[PDB]
Write a protein that holds these residues in place. Structure first.
Motif, PDB file in Angstrom:
ATOM      1  N   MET A   1      34.303  -7.283  11.944  1.00  0.00           N
ATOM      2  CA  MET A   1      33.254  -6.954  10.944  1.00  0.00           C
ATOM      3  C   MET A   1      33.215  -5.471  10.574  1.00  0.00           C
ATOM      4  O   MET A   1      32.798  -5.111   9.474  1.00  0.00           O
ATOM      5  CB  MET A   1      31.878  -7.389  11.464  1.00  0.00           C
ATOM      6  CG  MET A   1      31.624  -8.895  11.405  1.00  0.00           C
ATOM      7  SD  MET A   1      31.641  -9.569   9.714  1.00  0.00           S
ATOM      8  CE  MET A   1      31.183  -8.148   8.798  1.00  0.00           C
TER       9      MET A   1
ATOM     10  N   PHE B  24      34.232 -12.658   4.277  1.00  0.00           N
ATOM     11  CA  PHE B  24      33.267 -12.965   5.330  1.00  0.00           C
ATOM     12  C   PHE B  24      33.084 -14.471   5.459  1.00  0.00           C
ATOM     13  O   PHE B  24      33.079 -15.022   6.568  1.00  0.00           O
ATOM     14  CB  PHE B  24      31.903 -12.338   5.012  1.00  0.00           C
ATOM     15  CG  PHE B  24      30.815 -12.730   5.982  1.00  0.00           C
ATOM     16  CD1 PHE B  24      30.739 -12.140   7.240  1.00  0.00           C
ATOM     17  CD2 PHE B  24      29.884 -13.709   5.648  1.00  0.00           C
ATOM     18  CE1 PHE B  24      29.753 -12.519   8.150  1.00  0.00           C
ATOM     19  CE2 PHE B  24      28.893 -14.096   6.557  1.00  0.00           C
ATOM     20  CZ  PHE B  24      28.830 -13.501   7.805  1.00  0.00           C
ATOM     21  N   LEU B  25      32.949 -15.131   4.312  1.00  0.00           N
ATOM     22  CA  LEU B  25      32.720 -16.573   4.262  1.00  0.00           C
ATOM     23  C   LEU B  25      33.947 -17.449   4.490  1.00  0.00           C
ATOM     24  O   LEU B  25      33.816 -18.603   4.898  1.00  0.00           O
ATOM     25  CB  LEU B  25      32.082 -16.953   2.915  1.00  0.00           C
ATOM     26  CG  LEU B  25      30.670 -16.428   2.617  1.00  0.00           C
ATOM     27  CD1 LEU B  25      30.290 -16.729   1.168  1.00  0.00           C
ATOM     28  CD2 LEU B  25      29.681 -17.065   3.570  1.00  0.00           C
ATOM     29  N   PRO B  27      36.245 -17.747   6.846  1.00  0.00           N
ATOM     30  CA  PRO B  27      36.338 -18.425   8.147  1.00  0.00           C
ATOM     31  C   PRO B  27      35.043 -19.111   8.592  1.00  0.00           C
ATOM     32  O   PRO B  27      35.053 -19.947   9.494  1.00  0.00           O
ATOM     33  CB  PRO B  27      36.705 -17.292   9.117  1.00  0.00           C
ATOM     34  CG  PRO B  27      36.928 -16.061   8.236  1.00  0.00           C
ATOM     35  CD  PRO B  27      36.092 -16.297   7.031  1.00  0.00           C
ATOM     36  N   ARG B  28      33.931 -18.758   7.957  1.00  0.00           N
ATOM     37  CA  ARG B  28      32.633 -19.295   8.351  1.00  0.00           C
ATOM     38  C   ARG B  28      32.032 -20.376   7.464  1.00  0.00           C
ATOM     39  O   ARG B  28      31.108 -21.070   7.887  1.00  0.00           O
ATOM     40  CB  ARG B  28      31.646 -18.134   8.489  1.00  0.00           C
ATOM     41  CG  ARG B  28      32.160 -17.059   9.432  1.00  0.00           C
ATOM     42  CD  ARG B  28      31.227 -15.861   9.545  1.00  0.00           C
ATOM     43  NE  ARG B  28      31.735 -14.893  10.518  1.00  0.00           N
ATOM     44  CZ  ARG B  28      32.764 -14.079  10.301  1.00  0.00           C
ATOM     45  NH1 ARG B  28      33.403 -14.099   9.138  1.00  0.00           N
ATOM     46  NH2 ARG B  28      33.172 -13.257  11.253  1.00  0.00           N
ATOM     47  N   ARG B  29      32.559 -20.510   6.248  1.00  0.00           N
ATOM     48  CA  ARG B  29      32.106 -21.490   5.260  1.00  0.00           C
ATOM     49  C   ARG B  29      30.731 -21.211   4.669  1.00  0.00           C
ATOM     50  O   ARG B  29      30.551 -21.287   3.454  1.00  0.00           O
ATOM     51  CB  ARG B  29      32.117 -22.909   5.843  1.00  0.00           C
ATOM     52  CG  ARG B  29      31.400 -23.953   4.961  1.00  0.00           C
ATOM     53  CD  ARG B  29      32.063 -24.152   3.585  1.00  0.00           C
ATOM     54  NE  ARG B  29      33.320 -24.897   3.670  1.00  0.00           N
ATOM     55  CZ  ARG B  29      34.038 -25.296   2.620  1.00  0.00           C
ATOM     56  NH1 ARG B  29      33.636 -25.026   1.383  1.00  0.00           N
ATOM     57  NH2 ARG B  29      35.162 -25.978   2.809  1.00  0.00           N
ATOM     58  N   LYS B  30      29.757 -20.900   5.515  1.00  0.00           N
ATOM     59  CA  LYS B  30      28.408 -20.633   5.020  1.00  0.00           C
ATOM     60  C   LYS B  30      27.602 -19.758   5.965  1.00  0.00           C
ATOM     61  O   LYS B  30      27.894 -19.688   7.154  1.00  0.00           O
ATOM     62  CB  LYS B  30      27.656 -21.949   4.782  1.00  0.00           C
ATOM     63  CG  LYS B  30      27.542 -22.862   6.001  1.00  0.00           C
ATOM     64  CD  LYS B  30      26.679 -24.078   5.679  1.00  0.00           C
ATOM     65  CE  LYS B  30      26.663 -25.089   6.815  1.00  0.00           C
ATOM     66  NZ  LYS B  30      28.018 -25.677   7.049  1.00  0.00           N
ATOM     67  N   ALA B  31      26.588 -19.094   5.426  1.00  0.00           N
ATOM     68  CA  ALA B  31      25.735 -18.236   6.236  1.00  0.00           C
ATOM     69  C   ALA B  31      24.435 -17.949   5.502  1.00  0.00           C
ATOM     70  O   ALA B  31      24.379 -18.013   4.272  1.00  0.00           O
ATOM     71  CB  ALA B  31      26.460 -16.927   6.548  1.00  0.00           C
ATOM     72  N   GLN B  35      21.600 -13.042   6.890  1.00  0.00           N
ATOM     73  CA  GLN B  35      22.629 -12.606   7.834  1.00  0.00           C
ATOM     74  C   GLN B  35      23.695 -11.773   7.120  1.00  0.00           C
ATOM     75  O   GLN B  35      24.087 -10.708   7.593  1.00  0.00           O
ATOM     76  CB  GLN B  35      23.297 -13.806   8.517  1.00  0.00           C
ATOM     77  CG  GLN B  35      22.374 -14.573   9.454  1.00  0.00           C
ATOM     78  CD  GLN B  35      23.109 -15.575  10.335  1.00  0.00           C
ATOM     79  OE1 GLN B  35      22.490 -16.446  10.947  1.00  0.00           O
ATOM     80  NE2 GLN B  35      24.424 -15.445  10.415  1.00  0.00           N
ATOM     81  N   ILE B  36      24.160 -12.271   5.978  1.00  0.00           N
ATOM     82  CA  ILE B  36      25.174 -11.577   5.194  1.00  0.00           C
ATOM     83  C   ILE B  36      24.675 -10.175   4.856  1.00  0.00           C
ATOM     84  O   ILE B  36      25.391  -9.183   5.022  1.00  0.00           O
ATOM     85  CB  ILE B  36      25.475 -12.343   3.877  1.00  0.00           C
ATOM     86  CG1 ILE B  36      25.920 -13.776   4.205  1.00  0.00           C
ATOM     87  CG2 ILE B  36      26.550 -11.618   3.084  1.00  0.00           C
ATOM     88  CD1 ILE B  36      26.248 -14.634   2.987  1.00  0.00           C
ATOM     89  N   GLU B  75      27.098 -20.516   0.528  1.00  0.00           N
ATOM     90  CA  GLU B  75      28.246 -21.288   0.969  1.00  0.00           C
ATOM     91  C   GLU B  75      29.413 -21.083   0.022  1.00  0.00           C
ATOM     92  O   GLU B  75      29.241 -21.101  -1.195  1.00  0.00           O
ATOM     93  CB  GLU B  75      27.886 -22.779   1.020  1.00  0.00           C
ATOM     94  CG  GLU B  75      28.905 -23.638   1.742  1.00  0.00           C
ATOM     95  CD  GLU B  75      28.543 -25.112   1.728  1.00  0.00           C
ATOM     96  OE1 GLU B  75      27.347 -25.432   1.915  1.00  0.00           O
ATOM     97  OE2 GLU B  75      29.453 -25.949   1.541  1.00  0.00           O
TER      98      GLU B  75
END
Lengths: 100, 100
Positions: A1, B24-25, B27-31, B35-36, B75
């Protein structure tokens, strides 16, 4: 990050147009404003504005060559070359971590 | 020169902030929006504007989760994932050609 934020905060070199201009100049050192404008398919107006941003930040330098064929030349500075390389290296590291 | 122009014309994904949000998204798909905003050290206002640009172009989608803990979730869409990968691959190819 931590490296992602580094890239995200590069508002000068990060801009896609400016980045392209710097990548163009990296191997060539300098080129006439008119050539950059034509080869990168940019309007004289947009190119001009991006060049000003880059020059105010010491990434490039411009000067008129009036040796009797009026032309404005855009030259990447030594600082510009190093900053671009640093930014491109950070970008490369982030991409490599993604596994594409 | 042809691939350089391709990258230079990506005004949506090319922007350093939007690019970071997409990376950022990836590898994580959604957040959660919150948080972002915090992890990428962005103001709610700037994040909001970039998210709107991305969503209008179908790169991400947003929706409120009112399951009784009000939160806006961001997402990345399937299209967003592929476009980001395409752009990141083009960028990687240009960088590799530079020899750093």
């Amino acid at each position: 990050m931590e490296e992602l934020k580094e890239i995200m905060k590069s508002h000068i070199l990060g801009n896609p147009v400016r980045l392209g201009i710097m990548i163009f100049l990296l191997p060539r050192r300098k080129a006439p404003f008119s050539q950059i404008q034509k080869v990168l398919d940019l309007t004289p107006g947009n190119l001009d504005s991006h060049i000003r941003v880059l020059e105010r930040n010491g990434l490039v330098k411009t000067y008129k060559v009036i040796a009797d064929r009026p032309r404005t030349v855009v030259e990447i500075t030594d600082f510009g070359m190093e900053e671009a390389k640093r930014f491109l290296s950070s970008l490369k590291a982030v991409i490599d971590g993604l596994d594409l």
